[PDB]
Every structure is written in C-alpha cells, then in structure tokens.
Amino acid sequence: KIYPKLHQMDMDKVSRVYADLRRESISTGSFPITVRHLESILRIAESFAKMRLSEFVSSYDLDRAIKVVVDSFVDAQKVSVRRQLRRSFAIYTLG
Amino acid sequence: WIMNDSEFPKINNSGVYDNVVLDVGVDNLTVNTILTSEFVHDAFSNDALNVLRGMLKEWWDEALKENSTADLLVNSLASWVQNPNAKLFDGLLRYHVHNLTKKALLQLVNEFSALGSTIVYADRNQILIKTNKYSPENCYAY
C-alpha cells in the first residue's frame, strides 16, 4: 500500500556525506564508493518511512539512514585508521 | 617575473591554545641573511655578492667598536637594496636577497621546531611560538 516520497529534505548534508565518503576511500580504504552508493541512503530512508506507514520521509529517517551507511563503512576498515575515521565521521551523526 | 615578485610567505595556524605562547620579534633578518651567505640564468654574480658580504662584515665589525657612521651604513643597507633611485641598483640583487631571506625564515622556523614548540605565525617581524608548558610562571628558564 505505502509509497513514500522525498519532498522536503536536506540536500547539503547528503552531498557532504557522499563527498566525504568518496574522499576517505581512495586515500585510505578498499570499499568501492560510486554514485550507486548515494541512492542507497535515499532507499534506506524510504524503507524507514515505510516501517512507520507514513507517506512522507522525515528528517529522523534520513538521519538514521545516514548513520547506518556510515557505520557500515567505518567498521570495515583496518584497526589502525578506524579510530581516526570514526572521529572524522562523527559530526554528521550528532543525534 | 623577477621584478613582479615582492610577496612574502606567511604562516597562520589558527585555533585556541591552552598553553603559553611567546611573541618574539626578529630584527636584523636581511643583514644576517647577507652576512651568513652557468645553469642558473636568474642569479646575481657571485663575485659582487662576495664583495658585498665582505663590505657588510667589515662595516659590522667597525660598528661594534663604537662607530656611528658604520652603524648608520649597516642600518641603511636594507633601505638601499630595495631602492631603484639609488644607483648601482639591480633587480637581480633584490630577487637574490628576497629569495635567501625566504629560505632563512623557513630554516629559522625549522630550528625552532627542533625543541618542543609549534609555530603559530610568522611575518618577518613577529613570531608566535606554542610551548609545551602550561603556566607562564614556569617558562622563564625555557
């Protein structure tokens, strides 16, 4: 039944997150990040919206999707750079 | 290009520092640079450079022995270097002096970097240094 949409959302946060993830991959990382990973955040946001039976995606769902994607990338690093990467990416997931 | 390069590098490390910071003033940079020290097509002649070095050395030595005129000459040499209206003025000489001063400032910053401290600023007349200690009362000896 449900088909949520993405009318009002923060584009700048998502763009910054994508750019930071792209930068921190070639520099130190072996997890391929392309444009194909930008759309997964929006898909996860729509999924979290579906979980609530809501027809519009809110800020909480998008923030939760960003947190999930960031935690899925940080925990697949080496033990040497993981502590620095987690601190560097911690500003986005303030909540 | 060589007469249009008069910009000097600077260091502007910004932040809030909870340690003690020293504000030193470096005078006599140019004269120290001069006194200390085929393929290249943009350099001043080495022989005239050595002549100037000897002149400055003798002037400084006589200025040490209570000579007013020698002190005036030593003070006015830096003004003479950059003035085109002064005769015997060469743009290559000015470029040479600026380029060696630029290297000297970086070497001085590196020398300060030998001991525990961090550069904050550098402007050819003011240098700010971050110390390891936390209280100003404990940095008299250091």
């Binding site: 923060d10 700048d12 946060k13 910054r16 911690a90 500003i91 303030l94 | 249009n4 008069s6 910009e7 000097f8 910004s14 932040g15 809030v16 003070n75 006015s76 830096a78 003004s79 950059q82 402007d123 050819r124 007349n125």
Partner: protein
C-alpha cells in the same frame, strides 16, 4: 550574522567540535533553518588589498599594509613610531599595484583544461588532447581586483587613483 560570527569563534578549537556543533544546531533551531543550510555558513566579511614593503623614512621599518582589513590610524601612520605617512605616495603605490596586475594578466600563459600543460605553439586551435585552451589567471579574479580598488579609492579620499580608474 551575530549568531554565526559568535559560533565561528567557538568553532576554532579542534577539541570541542561536537559540543559546539550541538549548541550551534540548538541555536539555529530558534530560527527556521537547518544545520547544513548554505545560508547558515560563515564566510569572511572582508576582502584584502595588501601593498608590500612600504618604507618608513624616520624609522627604517619594512611593513606590509593592507588597505581593507587594517583599521584607520594604521593606514596613515607607522607602527614602531607614530609618524604620519604621505598620502600621494600611497596613491602612487596603489596605482603601481593596479597597473602591474593588469600587465601580469596581459602576459599570462595558456593551459589545457584536461592536460594541465603549457601551450607551446603560436597558432593552434586546441591541445593534441581533445580539449580547450584556458587561462592561468581567469578574468573573474582580475575583475574582482578592479572592483576592490574602486571601493578603496572611495572610502578614503584618493583622487589620483579614482582618476586612474576612469581613464581605463
């Protein structure tokens, strides 16, 4: 602007980033703005126009003077000794800076947009690479530089530089 400039001062810590960024978001919640809005980012309000190596005749001091950031009582007076400068000399130095900047723009080198390289031909259409010739000094920079001189010549009374701007 007051809240942004007050938060920017706190932000320069590098050790309390999260604590300050939480407070910034909470303060920005009073307004109807989001934490990553472009309108909520801090930029330096002032430009810069630095004339290097000005001589104090009575002080023998080498000082670099910036005509935008520096407050008055410093533009027209030496630092070590509070001796006033001569204004027409300042105007002539500003004119020298302007003409030198125009000359430097007029004698620049060309580059390929993709092959960052120097053009080595007097008559060519583009790189051997399929590309285009662009400038090392873009026009927008020199336009902004000519813009700032006009304001500097009007805040302080510099008639000679104002005339030099209008004879172009």
């Amino acid at each position: 602007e007051l809240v942004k400039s007050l938060c920017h001062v706190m932000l320069l810590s590098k050790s309390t980033i999260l604590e300050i960024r939480t407070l910034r978001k909470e303060l920005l919640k009073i307004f109807e703005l989001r934490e990553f809005a472009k309108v909520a980012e801090f930029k330096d309000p002032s430009l810069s126009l630095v004339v290097p190596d000005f001589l104090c005749e009575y002080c023998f001091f080498i000082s670099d003077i910036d005509f935008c950031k520096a407050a008055p009582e410093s533009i027209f007076s030496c630092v070590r000794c509070h001796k006033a400068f001569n204004q027409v000399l300042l105007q002539e130095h500003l004119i020298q800076k302007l003409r030198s900047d125009i000359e430097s723009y007029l004698i620049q080198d060309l580059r390929c947009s993709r092959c960052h390289k120097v053009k080595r031909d007097y008559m060519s259409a583009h790189c051997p690479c399929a590309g285009a010739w662009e400038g090392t000094l873009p026009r927008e920079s020199i336009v902004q530089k000519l813009n700032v001189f006009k304001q500097v010549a009007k805040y302080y009374g510099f008639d000679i530089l104002l005339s030099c701007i209008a004879d172009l």
